[PDB]
């Protein structure tokens, strides 16, 4: 089958902004999760062909991955922290929807989500 095009990371028609919360999401949250030994399956869009994940894009219609989030933060794509947090939550939810409970990738996502929630607990107030 074919993969879909990846999510956009910049759009010249969408307003762009940098806030200190978004800078924390890039410099602290994303960086912490990215280096985690479990992060690699989440660093790029699912290539369903090459991963032989059957029906991935029949089931997952809102794909999201940390590479996309990283590029969106780097391009000031998000207007607020809620939009960025939603993308992390979509990434985790997709993994929990497509995969069987107790699969290794689910346990990996749960570990990353636990760390994510730890880092978001200390999100700074807006400056
Ligand atoms: C997220 C999108 N995506 C990308 N690849 C995807 C998916 C998707 O949604 N479902 C998919 O199936 N895949 C393929 C898999 C293939 C296997 C790969 C893990 N292999 S591993 O790094 O060698 C490894 C790590 C940790 C292990 O054990 C610990 C023990 C306690 O806690 C955590 C587990 C372990 F035994 C083996 C994980 C992706």
UniProtKB/Swiss-Prot annotation:
Q: Where is this site: Acetylated histone binding?
A: 99
Q: What is the effect of changing residue 99 to A?
A: Abolishes binding to acetylated histones
Domain (Bromo): residue spans on this chain: 17-123
Described function: Chromatin reader protein that recognizes and binds acetylated histones and plays a key role in transmission of epigenetic memory across cell divisions and transcription regulation. Remains associated with acetylated chromatin throughout the entire cell cycle and provides epigenetic memory for postmitotic G1 gene transcription by preserving acetylated chromatin status and maintaining high-order chromatin structure. During interphase, plays a key role in regulating the transcription of signal-inducible genes by associating with the P-TEFb complex and recruiting it to promoters.
Q: What is known of its domains?
A: The NET domain mediates interaction with a number of chromatin proteins involved in transcription regulation (NSD3, JMJD6, CHD4, GLTSCR1 and ATAD5). The C-terminal (CTD) region mediates interaction and recruitment of CDK9 and CCNT1 subunits of the P-TEFb complex. It is also required for maintenance of higher-order chromatin structure.
Report quaternary structure and partners: Interacts with p53/TP53; the interaction is direct. Interacts (via CTD region) with CDK9 and CCNT1, acting as an associated component of P-TEFb complex. Interacts with RELA (when acetylated at 'Lys-310'). Interacts (via NET domain) with NSD3, CHD4, BICRA and ATAD5. The interaction with BICRA bridges BRD4 to the GBAF complex. Interacts (via NET domain) with JMJD6 (via JmjC and N-terminal domains); the interaction is stronger in presence of ssRNA and recruits JMJD6 on distal enhancers. Interacts with NSD3. Interacts with NIPBL. (Microbial infection) Interacts with bovine papillomavirus type 1 regulatory protein E2. This interactions may serve for the tethering of viral genomes to host mitotic chromosomes allowing successful partitioning of the viral genome during cell division.
Descriptive protein name: Bromodomain-containing protein 4
Native source species:
Homo sapiens (Human)
Query: What range of the parent protein does this fragment cover?
Result: 44 to 168 of 1362
């Amino acid at each position: 089958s074919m993969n879909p095009p990846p999510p956009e990371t910049s759009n010249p028609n969408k307003p762009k902004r940098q806030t200190n919360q978004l800078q924390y999401l890039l410099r602290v949250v994303l960086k912490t999760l990215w280096k985690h030994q479990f992060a690699w399956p989440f660093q790029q869009p699912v290539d369903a062909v090459k991963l032989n994940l059957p029906d991935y894009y029949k089931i997952i219609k809102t794909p999201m991955d940390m590479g996309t989030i990283k590029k969106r933060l780097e391009n000031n794509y998000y207007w607020n922290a809620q939009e960025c947090i939603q993308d992390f939550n979509t990434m985790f939810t997709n993994c929990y929807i497509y995969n069987k409970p107790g699969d290794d990738i689910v346990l990996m996502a749960e570990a990353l989500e636990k760390l994510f929630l730890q880092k978001i607990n200390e999100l700074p107030t807006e400056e």
